[PDB]
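Objective 1.3, modelling of assemblies. Example input:
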Amino acid sequence: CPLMVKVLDAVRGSPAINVAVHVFRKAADDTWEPFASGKTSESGELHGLTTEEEFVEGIYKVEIDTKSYWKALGISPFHEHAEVVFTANDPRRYTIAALLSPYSYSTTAVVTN
Amino acid sequence: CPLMVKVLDAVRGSPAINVAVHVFRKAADDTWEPFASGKTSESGELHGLTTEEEFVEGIYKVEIDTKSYWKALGISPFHEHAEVVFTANDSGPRRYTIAALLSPYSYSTTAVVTN
Amino acid sequence: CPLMVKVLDAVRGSPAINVAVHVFRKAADDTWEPFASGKTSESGELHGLTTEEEFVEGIYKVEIDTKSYWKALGISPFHEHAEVVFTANDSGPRRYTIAALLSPYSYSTTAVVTN
Amino acid sequence: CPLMVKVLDAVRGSPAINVAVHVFRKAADDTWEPFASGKTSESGELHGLTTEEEFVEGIYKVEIDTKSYWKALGISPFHEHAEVVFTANDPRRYTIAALLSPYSYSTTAVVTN
Ligand SMILES: O=C(O)c1ccc(-c2ccc(OCCCCCCOc3ccc(Nc4ccccc4C(=O)O)cc3)cc2)cc1
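Predicted structure (tokens):
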């Protein structure tokens, strides 16, 4: 599990559940190629995206479908999505945490061995 | 302004208006002595708390009354308030801005310190 | 100013100065068309990106070049940049401020929207 | 485990390890009485602070010794500490997460069953 994404709701003080997350890798032609995706769990976490063998060095984009999240709660959101773009370098485990509000998002990386 | 507070509302995407702020200074005796107070304006800013002469060295507490803010809006939040405690002016006079971002279950504060 | 960006540095407790910002608008064709660009001033603010007339309805991307900022300071950060994508002016003209707080391994953005 | 505290370093992208945390409960005379304390673990988490039986409704203060944390890293910090003050109400598990930078701290609550 070199990559885990966790999503939090700052309005309700809870995990953000059933949030779609899409991971892309940057290809040599600068396009974004699908890499991994899923929906956050009841704990707001998304496990099992990738394996060490697949997760090579490069530039990755994590897109979080925050607009659907908010609209399903009957709340009009500001952003079209939340995006986090980063280079993976060879400590080895990346946790991407995002904290969501209708008009704000924050993202932090915790990178450990 | 040697001491300013600015507050944003991350739910409404607006300044956080009419937020009460109480400032305290730790006294000789190690209690919190009231120092100044005010509330944020339509721009979410609070100016005119103090003066260069009055804002001497010390340990200051900026209490941001986030609970009353969310409750005045008829919303039930997590925290009682936001407290920001720092030593000020120990290397000569500086200008301090306390910036805060509020959500019902989260807040954040950052300090901008200028000479 | 219909569109403004302000950026703070949570490490130094200062405005984030000389941060490059590129704005894009999604085009007819579904690509990102360059729209405007600038860099933050000594106050960490970026004014004069656009005009009311030019800032029509659309989907806008504000790219904040945080990597170049941390690297110009000789520091190695996590993110490539900060991207902020939103639909603007779909209910008539508004004024948008994109506020960001930066640390090497974390950033945060909030929008203040006024009428 | 009705109360867990987690502390993150936004400068290094890591758990904030060996950070002292003190919990107090507000007494009827408005003083703060010691309640629980410890140091964050290698994951930046502090488990086992209290039990359901001890953790009654009331106002609690969590104080995080951020100044020592920064100074031990050779960094001059802005705040004297980070503090989080909240009322416990009868969902039942509170996670207090704090993200630290020299001149900033953020705190979020995740409150689940
Ligand atoms: O258990 C876990 O795995 C876990 C759970 C939760 C975790 C966290 C913890 C903390 C997190 O995020 C908070 C984020 C960063 C700080 C806050 C937000 O942003 C701003 C704050 C203040 C701002 N003010 C400002 C800036 C410039 C100009 C003007 C202003 C103003 O007027 O207020 C602007 C933006 C996210 C996730 C981490 C780990």
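Residues 66-72 of chain B form the longest helix (7 residues).
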